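Title: Request for sanity check on protein (midkine) prediction

Description:
We are preparing a figure and want to confirm that the structure record we downloaded matches what your pipeline produces today. Could someone re-run it with the sequence below and paste the raw structure tokens into this thread? We only need the token string, no images.
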Amino acid sequence: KKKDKVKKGGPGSECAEWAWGPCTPSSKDCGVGFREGTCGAQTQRIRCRVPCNWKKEFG
């Protein structure tokens, strides 16, 4: 019962700038969505809400 839930599971905050890639709906397509990247000698993900832009504009 462990699908590597990368969504939520730990905070970890450091290097405001930090090469922070955009978020990603590890599960649905928005709801929860953590970005992911590197700062200096660390690296990891952090959640971020997502406006369900699966289509970025349905029409």
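Thanks, this matches our download. Residues 1-59 form a domain with the Heparin-binding Growth Factor, Midkine; Chain A fold (CATH 2.20.60.10).
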